[PDB]
Symmetry: none
Subunit: 75 residues, 6 copies
């Protein structure tokens, strides 16, 4: 007899990452005044000082996608 195979899979799927800060309204972060007085300090070894007032950051190592959709027909 005859054989018919009709292999017609359909994909409309929507994998998405929405990461960080994306839809905020009137966000308005404010830093206050900062004062740093330093007279007779002694540092004998390596120094990594940071001074700021507003340190506003969005950092995203994340998000990203893997989509793996493999098809096989064996007769």
């Amino acid at each position: 007899g005859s054989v018919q195979i009709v292999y017609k899979p359909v994909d409309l799927s929507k994998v998405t990452s929405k990461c960080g800060s994306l839809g905020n309204i009137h966000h308005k972060p404010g830093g206050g005044q900062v004062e740093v007085k330093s007279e007779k300090l002694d540092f004998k070894d390596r120094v990594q000082s940071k001074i700021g007032s507003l340190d506003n950051i969005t950092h995203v190592p994340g998000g990203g996608n893997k989509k793996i959709e493999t098809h096989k027909l064996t007769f």
Copy 2:
């Protein structure tokens, strides 16, 4: 007799990651005044000083997606 195989899977799936500080309204974070005074300090070893007032951060190692969807027909 005859054979018919119809292989029409349908995918409409909508998988999503929504991560961090997304849809906020009038967020308005405020730092207060900061004062550091330092006379005669001694440091024999390595220093990682941070001074700020508002340290506003969104950090996202996360979110992100994996979709694995394999299809097989064997006659």
Copy 3:
């Protein structure tokens, strides 16, 4: 007799991760005044000092999705 196989699964699934700070209205966090006076301290070993007033953070290692949907027909 004749054989018909009609393989028509349908996927409309919506699995989602919602993580961090997503829908706040008039959030308004406020840091107070901060004062740090330091006279004659002695540090013999490594120092990791942090001074702030508002330390507003969203941190998200989490969220994210795995979807695994494998389809097989064997005749």
Copy 4:
């Protein structure tokens, strides 16, 4: 007998709009899947047959104000 008509309406109306920004607008429809099986599709008079098509309008006026005003005088 005689007729005097004095049609003197006076209009000082305002219709006004102030806007700081019309921002981000994201019109992104999707058709999904549609399947029709038959022996016939058979349409005979004024049929608005609309299988799986999309009709999409984005209208974004910076101000969209309307004033509609009709003055009628009829005499017989």
Copy 5:
């Protein structure tokens, strides 16, 4: 007897708009999948058969304001 008609309507009205920016407008419809199977498609009078088309309009006027005004005097 006699008829006097004085028709002197006065318009000093304003229709106005002020806008700071029309920003980002994204109009991105997607058609999906459409399938039609038959022995016949058979259309005989004024049929608007619309299988899987996209008909798309973007209309973004810096001000879209309308004044419509009709004056009618009718005499018999």
Copy 6:
């Protein structure tokens, strides 16, 4: 007996728009997939058959304002 008609309507109205920027407009439709199978397609009178087309309009006037004003005087 006499008729006097004095049709003297006065218009001093304003229709106006101020805009700071017309921004970024991204009209980008995509047609997806359409399939029709049959032994006949058979169209006989005023048929607007429209399989899988894209029809796209982008109207962006720096001001798109309308003043329409109609005067009629009818006398018998």
